[PDB]
Design a protein around this motif. Structure first.
Motif, PDB file in Angstrom:
ATOM      1  N   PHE A   1       1.501   7.957  21.300  1.00 31.40           N
ATOM      2  CA  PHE A   1       2.355   8.083  20.124  1.00 31.40           C
ATOM      3  C   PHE A   1       1.467   8.316  18.896  1.00 31.40           C
ATOM      4  O   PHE A   1       0.299   7.909  18.939  1.00 31.40           O
TER       5      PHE A   1
ATOM      6  N   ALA B   1       2.586   4.870  14.194  1.00 30.08           N
ATOM      7  CA  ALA B   1       3.611   4.107  14.911  1.00 30.08           C
ATOM      8  C   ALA B   1       3.084   2.794  15.428  1.00 30.08           C
ATOM      9  O   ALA B   1       1.939   2.695  15.861  1.00 30.08           O
TER      10      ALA B   1
ATOM     11  N   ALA C   1       3.727   1.096  18.311  1.00 36.26           N
ATOM     12  CA  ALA C   1       4.277   1.320  19.642  1.00 36.26           C
ATOM     13  C   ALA C   1       3.989   0.181  20.628  1.00 36.26           C
ATOM     14  O   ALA C   1       4.825  -0.095  21.487  1.00 36.26           O
TER      15      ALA C   1
ATOM     16  N   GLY D   1      13.421   3.677  18.349  1.00 33.24           N
ATOM     17  CA  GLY D   1      12.566   4.722  17.788  1.00 33.24           C
ATOM     18  C   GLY D   1      11.946   4.304  16.473  1.00 33.24           C
ATOM     19  O   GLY D   1      12.164   3.186  15.998  1.00 33.24           O
ATOM     20  N   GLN D   2      11.136   5.183  15.891  1.00 31.16           N
ATOM     21  CA  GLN D   2      10.485   4.939  14.601  1.00 31.16           C
ATOM     22  C   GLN D   2      10.397   6.212  13.791  1.00 31.16           C
ATOM     23  O   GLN D   2      10.170   7.295  14.338  1.00 31.16           O
TER      24      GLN D   2
ATOM     25  N   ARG E   1       8.538  11.322  12.914  1.00 32.86           N
ATOM     26  CA  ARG E   1       9.493  10.600  13.738  1.00 32.86           C
ATOM     27  C   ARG E   1       9.090  10.695  15.206  1.00 32.86           C
ATOM     28  O   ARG E   1       8.515  11.701  15.613  1.00 32.86           O
ATOM     29  N   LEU E   2       9.348   9.640  15.991  1.00 34.01           N
ATOM     30  CA  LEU E   2       9.020   9.630  17.418  1.00 34.01           C
ATOM     31  C   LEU E   2      10.033  10.469  18.179  1.00 34.01           C
ATOM     32  O   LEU E   2      11.229  10.362  17.913  1.00 34.01           O
ATOM     33  N   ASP E   3       9.567  11.314  19.111  1.00 34.81           N
ATOM     34  CA  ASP E   3      10.432  12.185  19.919  1.00 34.81           C
ATOM     35  C   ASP E   3      10.832  11.475  21.231  1.00 34.81           C
ATOM     36  O   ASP E   3      11.766  11.902  21.925  1.00 34.81           O
ATOM     37  N   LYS E   4      10.152  10.357  21.520  1.00 33.56           N
ATOM     38  CA  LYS E   4      10.384   9.466  22.652  1.00 33.56           C
ATOM     39  C   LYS E   4      10.483   8.049  22.150  1.00 33.56           C
ATOM     40  O   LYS E   4       9.797   7.698  21.187  1.00 33.56           O
TER      41      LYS E   4
ATOM     42  N   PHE F   1       9.864   4.012  21.662  1.00 32.11           N
ATOM     43  CA  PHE F   1       8.689   3.150  21.860  1.00 32.11           C
ATOM     44  C   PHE F   1       9.076   1.914  22.671  1.00 32.11           C
ATOM     45  O   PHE F   1       8.214   1.254  23.235  1.00 32.11           O
TER      46      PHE F   1
END
Length: 349
Positions: A3, A7, A9, A279-280, A294-297, A299
């Motif tokens: 990540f 983040a 994570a 998410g974040q 922004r996270l696409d997956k 955490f």
């Protein structure tokens, strides 16, 4: 980097600790609305607030009673759980926040007070943002306290904004912007205002000068400013619901949120349909409406049995409480709308 390095994570489940809060069918409360004894936390205990009070981690958990059987709608009240380490908790046998014969009875009866988020000011005022549910409309409301026992209810957060335009607006899930000051997490003031991320179907940004009366930010057409919206084919394809209070970091404002996955091709097939995965998003520190990344997956995802299945069968890791305690971050969340659990992030290895 699995990540991006901005983040947080690495939140991990501490061994043999979860659930930290579970339903208790033996505790009782005399409800001022029901005018009768109620097993106020007998069916489910979830979606919690978390804050630091007098050197302890305090979790204010959403508890549902047995006012109905099975499917039948119930009342939400908030329980009080306290811990010295953030992992092992003790509990009060009565709720500390609930619908009562007060100025908020038309907005809170019979659904109660749901999904709180708590943050504290530098001068020790705890500010709670929760949902008022009367089974007709959901409203984001404000309550304050100095001891987390005695609460003052102020009503809907958007009651006065733009001549009372959003008093009847369907609102919930607010994340106030906070920062660390000498290791203590406090409500942050940016450009002489207080700031919050709020929303379920999308994220709007609201501001305040008094922490009670909040004003949603609007676009050129007078519609809500949407800084985060659900993304087709991603884990947050159905909902982008704010999690715990936002935290200012060295990279910008970090917003931890809850993503609901759509069923089918409109969602991400790698994650369970209709499940909530966390998410974040990273916002500009000087302009909290400006999204950087922004996270696409997700955490954080449902992994334990109580997380994958419960009152909410598709499962959740509904993140809603975040505290910095003894140099670690403790994330408190609801497990499939039935249990309360914690994840720990050690930012120093």
């Amino acid at each position: 980097s699995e990540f991006p390095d901005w983040a947080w994570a690495d939140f991990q489940r501490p061994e043999g600790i979860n659930p930290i809060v579970s339903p208790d069918t033996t505790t009782v409360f005399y409800c001022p609305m029901r005018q009768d004894s109620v097993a106020w936390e007998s069916s489910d205990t979830f979606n919690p607030a978390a804050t630091i009070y007098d050197g302890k981690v305090v979790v204010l958990y959403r508890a549902e009673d047995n006012s109905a059987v099975g499917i039948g709608s119930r009342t939400s009240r908030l329980g009080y759980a306290y811990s010295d380490d953030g992992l092992h908790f003790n509990r009060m046998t009565v709720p500390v926040f609930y619908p009562a014969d007060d100025n908020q009875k038309e907005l809170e009866w019979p659904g109660g007070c749901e999904d709180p988020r708590v943050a504290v000011t530098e001068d020790g005022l705890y500010v709670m943002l929760y949902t008022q549910w009367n089974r007709k409309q959901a409203r984001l409301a404000v309550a304050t306290s100095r001891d987390l026992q005695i609460w003052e209810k102020y009503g809907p957060a958007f009651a006065k904004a733009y001549g009372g335009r959003f008093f009847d607006e369907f609102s919930k899930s607010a994340s106030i912007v906070t920062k660390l000051v000498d290791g203590k997490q406090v409500i942050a003031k940016i450009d002489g205002k207080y700031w919050m991320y709020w929303g379920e179907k999308f994220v709007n940004v609201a501001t305040s000068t008094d922490l009670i009366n909040w004003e949603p930010m609007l676009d050129e057409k007078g519609d809500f400013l949407k800084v985060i919206t659900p993304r087709e084919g991603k884990f947050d394809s159905d909902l982008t619901e704010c999690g715990p209070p936002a935290i200012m970091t060295d990279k910008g404002i970090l917003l931890l949120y809850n993503g609901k996955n759509k069923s089918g091709a409109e969602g991400d097939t790698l994650y369970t349909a209709n499940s909530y995965c966390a998410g974040q998003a990273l916002f500009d520190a000087k302009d909290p409406t400006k999204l950087i990344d922004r996270l696409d997956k997700p955490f954080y995802i449902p992994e334990s049995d109580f997380e994958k299945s419960g009152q909410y069968p598709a499962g959740t890791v509904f993140i809603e409480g975040l505290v910095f305690h003894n140099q670690k971050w403790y994330l408190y969340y609801g497990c499939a709308d039935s249990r309360v659990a914690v994840a720990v992030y050690d930012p120093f290895k």
